[PDB]
Design a protein around this ligand. Structure first.
Ligand SMILES: Nc1nc2c(ncn2[C@H]2C[C@H](O)[C@@H](COP(=O)(O)OP(=O)(O)OP(=O)(O)O)O2)c(=O)[nH]1
Ligand SMILES: [Ca+2]
Ligand SMILES: [Ca+2]
Ligand SMILES: [Ca+2]
Length: 341
DNA sequence: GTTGGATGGTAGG
DNA sequence: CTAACCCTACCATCCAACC
């Protein structure tokens, strides 16, 4: 069982460099402008030239411009990166039909029936990389291991423009050596709970009574971690199926006024319904982000599919339901559809 | 004794 | 308006309905 994982390098920015070769070699920052004020919004991603100065996904644009005034700031174009992505995902399809698309820039190929061993996987990996570079002019990073988790880790070690195998040896070693916060799915809240406990390595999780582990991090992560340490984790590559689709936008200024908010919410339903694409949902949720950035939502599930007419009506009720139960003002508003037929 | 809906927490793209 | 966009997956909790 060999899994190969591909993750595109600084994707959004790379696509702009390809689309405009004069940018290449100098700082580039791809932004989501929010409309509230001059240069408001956040960074979606930056090239490595820019990361050298502290500019990464998530920081505010005005922060980016503080520390890197002279870089090139480009509005985000989602449609463009998604067509390049789809073209790339199709190239990958010619190397294994057994493909799991994980996000707009990464995919898992199960390559067992294509290669006899790690050495061949590596070669196939080099072949994938050239293919993509030839057809799309995009560099990527490749991770190869016996499962999804470790293929992901191997890639994280190799970025950017890399390729790395973690063979059955190294898997055994990393279950002992690797800091536990480097396990995909272990973020900041969970790492704290584990270090306060004295779990620093995947291996430590077999040295602790299951219920205390489960008591702290929850059942599912516990099973996840323990499964990973027994070297039994074997969750297969599966064709992903969107479970929800939605959209949320930022308002020019904070509001509580249903009339002032309404057109924002409706924009979101329109876009949302466009992306639905023949999918009928039974569940609608209105999501609202507040002044202090806390996220609040109100929903409903119908025994039956929701039409675009119903969505407009139910969402307005739900918005009011929010305004009713939370007295904070609203800063971003949107909607999320789920539970398809 | 377990669905599952409503809501929120966590993680990561 | 004075920083914090953006989209999705999975899980936990509290709560009800079933039976
Ligand atoms: N709007 C927004 N978009 C993001 C954010 N994080 C990632 N993206 C988008 C932009 C990235 O180019 C793309 C892929 O994200 P990645 O996590 O793989 O990092 P990226 O490819 O940009 O650099 P790479 O070498 O992986 O590290 O997804 C974010 O916080 N906000
Ligand atoms: Ca990437
Ligand atoms: Ca990625
Ligand atoms: Ca981590």
């Amino acid at each position: 069982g060999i899994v190969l994982f591909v993750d595109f390098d600084y994707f959004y920015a790379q696509v702009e460099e390809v689309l405009n070769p004069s940018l290449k070699g100098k700082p580039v920052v791809v932004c989501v402008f929010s409309g509230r004020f001059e240069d408001s919004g956040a960074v979606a991603t930056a090239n490595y030239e820019a990361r050298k100065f502290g500019v990464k996904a998530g920081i505010p644009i005005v922060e980016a411009k503080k520390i890197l005034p002279n870089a090139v700031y480009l509005p985000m174009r989602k449609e463009v990166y998604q067509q390049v992505s789809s073209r790339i995902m199709n190239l990958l399809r010619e190397y294994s039909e057994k493909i799991e698309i994980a996000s707009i820039d990464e995919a898992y190929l199960d390559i067992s029936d294509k290669v006899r061993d790690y050495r061949e996987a590596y070669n196939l990996g080099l072949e994938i990389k050239n293919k993509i570079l030839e057809k799309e002019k995009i560099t990527v990073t490749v991770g190869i291991s016996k499962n999804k988790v470790f293929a992901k880790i191997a890639a994280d070690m190799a970025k950017p423009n890399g390729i790395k195998v973690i063979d059955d040896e190294e898997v055994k070693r990393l279950i002992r050596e690797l800091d536990i916060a480097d396990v995909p799915g272990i973020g900041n809240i969970t790492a704290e709970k584990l270090k306060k406990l004295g779990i620093n390595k995947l291996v430590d999780t077999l040295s602790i009574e299951f219920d205390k582990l489960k008591g702290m991090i929850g059942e599912a992560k516990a099973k996840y971690l323990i499964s990973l340490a027994r070297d039994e984790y074997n969750e297969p590559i599966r064709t992903r199926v969107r479970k929800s689709i939605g959209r949320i936008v930022t308002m020019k200024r904070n509001s509580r006024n249903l009339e002032e908010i309404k057109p924002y919410l409706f924009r979101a339903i329109e876009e949302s319904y466009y992306k639905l694409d023949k999918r009928i949902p039974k569940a609608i949720h209105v999501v609202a982000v507040t002044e202090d950035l806390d996220i609040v939502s109100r929903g409903r599930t119908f025994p039956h599919g929701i039409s675009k007419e119903t969505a407009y009506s139910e969402s307005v009720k739900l918005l009011q339901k929010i305004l009713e139960e939370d007295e904070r003002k609203i800063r971003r508003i949107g909607v999320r559809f789920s539970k398809f037929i």
